[PDB]
Design an enzyme around this catalytic site. Structure first.
Site, mmCIF file in Angstrom:
data_model
loop_
_atom_site.group_PDB
_atom_site.id
_atom_site.type_symbol
_atom_site.label_atom_id
_atom_site.label_comp_id
_atom_site.label_asym_id
_atom_site.label_seq_id
_atom_site.Cartn_x
_atom_site.Cartn_y
_atom_site.Cartn_z
ATOM 1 C CD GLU A 114 -3.349 -0.698 1.973
ATOM 2 O OE1 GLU A 114 -4.007 0.090 2.429
ATOM 3 O OE2 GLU A 114 -3.185 -1.830 2.332
ATOM 4 N N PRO A 149 -1.985 5.611 8.929
ATOM 5 C CG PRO A 149 -3.745 6.583 7.654
ATOM 6 C CD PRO A 149 -2.657 5.521 7.689
ATOM 7 C CD1 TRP A 161 -7.344 5.084 11.078
ATOM 8 C CD2 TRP A 161 -8.586 6.255 9.835
ATOM 9 N NE1 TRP A 161 -7.188 4.534 9.810
ATOM 10 C CE2 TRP A 161 -7.895 5.167 9.055
ATOM 11 C CE3 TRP A 161 -9.268 6.757 9.127
ATOM 12 C CZ2 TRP A 161 -7.701 4.824 7.581
ATOM 13 C CZ3 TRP A 161 -9.418 6.619 7.368
ATOM 14 C CH2 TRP A 161 -8.694 5.722 6.907
HETATM 15 O O1 LIG Z 1 -1.996 -6.762 7.148
HETATM 16 C C1 LIG Z 1 -1.290 -6.090 6.179
HETATM 17 C C2 LIG Z 1 -1.777 -4.736 5.696
HETATM 18 O O2 LIG Z 1 -2.311 -4.060 6.742
HETATM 19 C C3 LIG Z 1 -2.434 -2.561 7.289
HETATM 20 O O3 LIG Z 1 -3.408 -2.049 6.357
HETATM 21 C C4 LIG Z 1 -4.426 -1.077 6.993
HETATM 22 O O4 LIG Z 1 -3.819 -0.436 7.946
HETATM 23 C C5 LIG Z 1 -3.615 0.928 8.168
HETATM 24 C C6 LIG Z 1 -4.275 1.514 9.191
HETATM 25 O O5 LIG Z 1 -4.644 3.060 8.893
HETATM 26 C C7 LIG Z 1 -3.821 1.839 6.734
HETATM 27 O O6 LIG Z 1 -3.020 2.831 6.415
HETATM 28 C C8 LIG Z 1 -4.530 1.140 5.411
HETATM 29 O O7 LIG Z 1 -5.210 1.993 4.608
HETATM 30 C C9 LIG Z 1 -4.924 -0.137 5.811
HETATM 31 O O8 LIG Z 1 -5.110 -1.273 4.567
HETATM 32 C C10 LIG Z 1 -1.266 -1.732 6.691
HETATM 33 O O9 LIG Z 1 -1.193 -0.559 6.590
HETATM 34 C C11 LIG Z 1 -0.534 -2.333 5.321
HETATM 35 O O10 LIG Z 1 0.743 -1.920 5.301
HETATM 36 C C12 LIG Z 1 -0.954 -3.704 5.099
HETATM 37 O O11 LIG Z 1 -0.992 -4.146 3.787
#
Ligand SMILES: OC[C@H]1O[C@H](O[C@H]2O[C@H](CO)[C@@H](O)[C@H](O)[C@H]2O)[C@H](O)[C@@H](O)[C@@H]1O
Ligand SMILES: OC[C@H]1O[C@H](O[C@H]2O[C@H](CO)[C@@H](O)[C@H](O)[C@H]2O)[C@H](O)[C@@H](O)[C@@H]1O
Lengths: 243, 239
Positions: free
Chosen positions: B34, B46, B51
């Site tokens: 991401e 975040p 949030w």
């Molecule tokens: O478990 C792997 C993924 O989880 C996390 O993904 C969420 O968590 C964050 C919390 O705010 C966000 O930024 C995000 O939009 C979410 O998808 C993680 O951030 C990622 O690194 C991983 O793909």
């Protein structure tokens, strides 16, 4: 309580099964081969590069042509920081893979960090990761089965099928090379007195969830989260050199 | 004549992660992280207290407190070079994930790219991935079950233990609303027609969806519950 792990290994030695297996828990970082990229190409090693000392054209022709990339120009600190943030889960745990052929790279790169804190591989890992990772070491006694998977993978460009040729001299080369990475890690573990969480692949295949839990445990994670065709060339490569 | 890059445009805890990781197992569709999620002041994703920053010590007590990370000092050129290399496989395909809440970050970040090809989100996407990414859009339409996962995880910190609480799952279910709008209203406002899988379709038949993504990349398909306890009855909390 360590906040980071780092898996020490060799290409196609299993580190993947473990390491992806971790990523899925979602409390063990986003491990990657953060240290694979060459600084002159900002790419992973390319097929013709792994064989840069082979002038045997019959093997050469099996390999893609080089791409020229571009020098990575990130400052050391910026490089470290990117790695530190991409590799790390919201829980704050970081993971990644490190192959023995990459160690010089990492050490070259850490050299210009402020506060560098040593001059060797161990300090390098520490200064780049930002803490003292739980070292883990997946290894494979069957070099041939591995060399084989490697010599396939370097042709097809797929590391997880029509073009792939057998070739003895090459496999020999890959074997001579994988063996050397082993002597590499071996010498290093003694060199800087480190005792990794050693775990060869057969054990790893068998007991996944066991290990995926121990590592899980060493990072202070609930071990709860740890989830659940023969090689003709390997027969062939024996008959025909090093092993 | 391969398009050699894909985004998955989606929202927190949709099928998003399940699709993307499957593709990653291929060894042939890059390393779809991401990349756009990290905030510039902290250089991390975040965090809870971040949030829920809009008025009630009923939630602000379920949420781990604000860590503070560090400033992202990477010039945009380096930022985009890194995303381009780390997201690629050896075969040269790049993959990644994007989430409506991150889209302003992307754009704000792309403004300093030397070759800016345009001014909106979509040229941003292109200028960053260095190409034209096959769009995949995931939605789980059951907003209650989505909002639940996002609240469980917004306090567990594990996005793949702590309690239910309705007035929050409001804020969620409705933040997730205005996010999912965004996407739909972007799809026409820049005339994009993304492939359009859905969570039920996936959690059931993900073997096809992946096999679709792979052909679009020119590859080889052959490679591959406090819900009811929200379902408040009484209070009038948007659902
Ligand atoms: O478990 C792997 C993924 O989880 C996390 O993904 C969420 O968590 C964050 C919390 O705010 C966000 O930024 C995000 O939009 C979410 O998808 C993680 O951030 C990622 O690194 C991983 O793909
Ligand atoms: O030889 C070039 C590199 O390839 C291997 O790694 C690739 O394989 C995995 C594919 O899913 C990826 O995790 C990764 O990003 C690749 O680069 C190998 O492991 C490497 O050490 C080489 O850098």
């Amino acid at each position: 309580h360590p906040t980071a792990y780092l898996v020490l290994a060799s290409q196609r030695s299993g580190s993947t099964l473990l390491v992806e297996s971790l990523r899925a828990t979602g409390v063990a970082g986003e491990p990657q081969e953060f240290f694979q990229y060459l600084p002159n190409t900002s790419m992973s090693p390319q097929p013709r590069e792994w064989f840069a000392d082979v002038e045997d054209q019959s093997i050469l022709r099996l390999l893609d042509p080089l791409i020229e990339g571009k020098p990575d120009l990130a400052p050391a600190t910026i490089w470290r920081d990117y790695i530190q943030t991409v590799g790390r889960t919201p829980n704050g745990v970081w993971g990644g893979k490190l192959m023995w052929n990459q160690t010089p790279l990492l050490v070259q790169r850490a050299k210009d960090l402020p506060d560098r804190s040593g001059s060797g591989l161990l300090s390098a890992i520490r200064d780049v990761v930002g803490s003292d990772p739980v070292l883990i070491h997946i290894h494979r006694p069957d070099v041939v089965s591995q060399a084989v998977s490697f010599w396939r993978a370097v042709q097809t460009r797929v590391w997880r099928d029509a073009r792939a040729e057998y070739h003895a001299g090459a496999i020999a080369h890959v074997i001579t090379m994988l063996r050397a990475q082993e002597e590499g890690w071996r010498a290093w573990f003694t060199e800087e007195n480190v005792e990794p969480i050693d775990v060869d692949y057969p054990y790893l295949w068998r007991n996944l969830t066991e290990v995926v839990g121990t590592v899980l445990e060493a990072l202070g994670q609930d071990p709860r989260l740890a989830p659940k065709r023969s090689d003709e060339w390997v027969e062939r490569y024996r008959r025909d050199l090093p092993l």
